[PDB]
């Protein structure tokens, strides 16, 4: 009922024959002749008659390659004495053949200027392989293997990134197709394909094409989305204390790719830090340190070791950072309405308690606080406060950020929340302590002021806990963070050493 009878035999014959031709003594011209002849026979077999039969053809070929891979692996397991190199060489044989066929079909689809047909065929084949992957994953489960799909995807990617004009004119749509493909194949959607998936993202030519060669940084949003998917998958396991070996390796890999992105494309991590932090768990210090340490290339950071004043960066303090993530949309319309209303009229005062009730939506087990809503609240209120101060006629200082509706929220959330809430809150504040700008300065002053005019000693203990925690770990360390922490120690206007938590444990006391 699936396919018309005899179709699988046609597909098998054609595929096998193309496998024979591809590895045959064939150079460029020979490949052109063999391709023309093969397309001819393909027409003659009545396959390219309709899009349906084409879909069936590609699907059958894909499934055949997959089953060949499975047979190879089973053969390897039953006979461990067999050379694994040849076992891999069979899969490589058939898969490379099929991939080359696909690439050649895409390249010569329609006329030279006919990019639409080529792209449509690309998304067609890709979608087909994706469907086969999902079906195979759903039916085999633990028996699922990634080798065929992995090789197909990466080899097709390499084939379509070849240095030729036709592929160059459609490069962006190609990268788009591969991006959509990789998004549909999310680790939360296809767990057993995770490793290869990462290798599909962190691959050198894909990173090069997405973040470097693509002009106007148009590839940045898509890659950012893929990274967000990875972080989403990693989040629930990283939040847990114990971490299994698979998760450990996946995490190490993530560290490596993130290190690469940090060293080569700091502006990318800089422009999209908010979403990443909005996905990454607060207890993961290294990742957030990799992301918060990102800052533009042209900027030269002042020495944090021996600071003279804020006059060295005074030209960059008035410069507002860039947030390519709509955080205001996270907030419910009514909540945002009341928020702006209070930020405008500073009334009523009950809005604080109502707000605290509004950011701990307890309707699902495990999670007690809407972290994203907290981050959104902190960032929005902060930016609004900066705007208000600037519109007033002055710049945000230690004395200019005080006694406002914006500060009332911070104070209230600081004193009228439990340890968890204030933990997430202070993390939300510390996430803005980065390279010299308006945000890092305002939130540094905010953090320090919250420490100073603190009701209980517990709040101070929490602030010190955060600022220290983000500095005990290995490099890298965010600039604004380090500065903000230094201000707690250097300036005697806080009486830091007079507190009890500093003299709590011998290890802690010896740490300072």
């Amino acid at each position: 009922y699936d396919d018309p009878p005899g179709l699988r035999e046609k597909a098998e014959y054609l595929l096998r024959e193309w496998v024979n031709l591809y590895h045959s003594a064939a150079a460029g011209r020979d490949s052109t002749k063999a391709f023309s002849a093969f397309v001819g026979q393909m027409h003659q077999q009545g396959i390219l008659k309709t899009d349906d039969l084409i879909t069936r053809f590609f699907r059958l070929c894909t499934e055949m390659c997959v089953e060949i891979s499975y047979r190879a692996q089973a053969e390897q397991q039953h006979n461990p004495a067999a050379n694994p190199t040849m076992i891999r060489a069979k899969c490589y044989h058939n898969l490379d053949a099929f991939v080359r066929l696909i690439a050649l079909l895409v390249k010569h689809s329609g006329e030279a200027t006919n990019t639409v047909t080529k792209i449509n065929l690309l998304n067609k084949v890709l979608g087909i392989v994706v469907g086969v992957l999902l079906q195979d994953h759903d039916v085999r489960q633990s028996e699922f293997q990634q080798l065929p799909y992995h090789r197909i995807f990466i080899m097709l990617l390499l084939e379509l990134n070849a240095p030729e004009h036709v592929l160059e004119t459609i490069n962006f749509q190609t990268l788009t197709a591969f991006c959509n493909t990789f998004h549909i194949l999310r680790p939360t959607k296809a767990p057993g394909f995770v490793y290869a998936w990462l290798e599909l993202i962190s691959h050198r030519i894909f990173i090069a094409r997405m973040l470097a060669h693509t002009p106007q940084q148009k590839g940045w949003p898509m890659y950012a989305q893929l990274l967000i998917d990875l972080f989403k998958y990693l989040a629930p396991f990283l939040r847990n204390v114990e971490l299994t070996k698979p998760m450990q390796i996946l995490y190490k890999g993530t560290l490596r790719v993130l290190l690469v992105l940090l060293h080569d494309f700091p502006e990318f991590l800089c422009d999209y830090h908010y979403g990443f932090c909005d996905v990454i768990p607060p207890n993961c210090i290294q990742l957030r340190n990799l992301i918060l340490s990102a800052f533009p290339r042209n900027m030269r950071l002042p020495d944090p070791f021996t600071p003279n004043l804020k006059v060295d960066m005074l030209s960059e303090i008035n410069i507002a950072p860039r947030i390519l993530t709509n955080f205001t949309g996270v907030m419910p319309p009514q909540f945002k309405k009341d928020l702006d209303s209070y930020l405008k009229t500073r009334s009523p005062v009950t809005f604080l308690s109502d707000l605290r009730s509004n950011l701990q939506v307890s309707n699902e087990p495990g999670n007690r606080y809407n972290l994203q809503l907290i981050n959104a609240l902190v960032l929005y209120v902060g930016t609004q406060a900066i705007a208000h101060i600037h519109n007033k006629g002055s710049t945000p200082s230690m004395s200019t950020i005080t006694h406002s509706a914006h500060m009332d929220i911070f104070q209230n959330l600081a004193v009228d929340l439990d340890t968890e809430g204030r933990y997430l809150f202070l993390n939300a504040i510390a996430n803005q302590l980065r390279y010299p700008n308006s945000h890092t300065h305002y939130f540094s002053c905010t953090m320090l002021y919250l420490f100073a005019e603190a009701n209980t000693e517990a709040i101070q203990e929490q602030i010190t806990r955060v600022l220290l925690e983000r500095l005990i770990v290995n490099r890298p360390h965010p600039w604004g963070l380090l500065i903000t922490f230094i201000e707690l120690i250097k300036n005697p206007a806080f009486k830091f050493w007079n507190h009890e938590f500093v003299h709590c444990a011998p290890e802690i006391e010896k740490l300072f």
Binding site: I207, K245, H263, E507
Partner: protein, 191 residues
């Protein structure tokens, strides 16, 4: 004083726990990133030589599919006439090349075996290949060691250099052994 893990107590307990278990370091002290394969202190990019998320070393020139002229590709033409790969009939230069370039591979071990056949011995501590020098006999010869001028291979300058050594037989390696691990994958142990 905070009576939870959100205070300094939770932090110190996390430090101790991370000092105990290595699989819990992601939350506490974190791992040294400079110990990883890539070089963080490089003026140029490192992504074009980025192999895999689990690679402990950057790409080798023999791992980069560069676009060579069509005249260079001859494997399809001479797949029948080209001589097979025999380590025995190669020069020591080629042997050293196959040793140093193919790290973590069986080819390094095979090259090491051939070198071992050419009366070369690998010093485990000196991390270099050492052999006898022509006309040079050791000054002192004991049952545990021997010292004198020998020939070692400088890999930095890629040239055979003479140097006086104090070679202990324990520090020297016997014949290299070949693994029998079926379907071995290093990326599996990148935890």
């Amino acid at each position: 004083m905070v009576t939870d893990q959100f205070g300094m107590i939770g932090l110190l307990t996390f430090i101790r726990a991370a000092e105990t278990d290595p699989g819990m370091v992601h939350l506490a002290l974190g791992s040294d990133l400079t110990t990883l394969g890539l070089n963080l202190n490089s003026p140029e990019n490192l992504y074009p030589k980025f192999a895999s998320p689990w690679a402990s070393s950057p790409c080798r020139p023999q791992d980069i599919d560069f676009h060579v002229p069509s005249e260079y590709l001859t494997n399809i033409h001479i797949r029948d006439k080209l001589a097979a790969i025999k380590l025995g009939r190669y020069g020591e230069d080629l042997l050293f090349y196959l040793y140093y370039m193919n790290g973590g591979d069986v080819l390094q071990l095979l090259a090491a075996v051939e070198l071992f056949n050419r009366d070369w011995r690998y010093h485990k501590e000196e991390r270099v290949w050492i052999t006898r020098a022509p006309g040079m006999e050791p000054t002192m010869k004991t049952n545990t060691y021997e010292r004198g001028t020998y020939y070692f291979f400088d890999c930095l300058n890629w040239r055979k250099v003479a140097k006086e050594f104090h070679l202990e037989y324990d520090k020297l390696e016997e014949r290299p052994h070949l693994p029998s691990t079926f379907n071995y994958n290093p990326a599996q142990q990148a935890f």
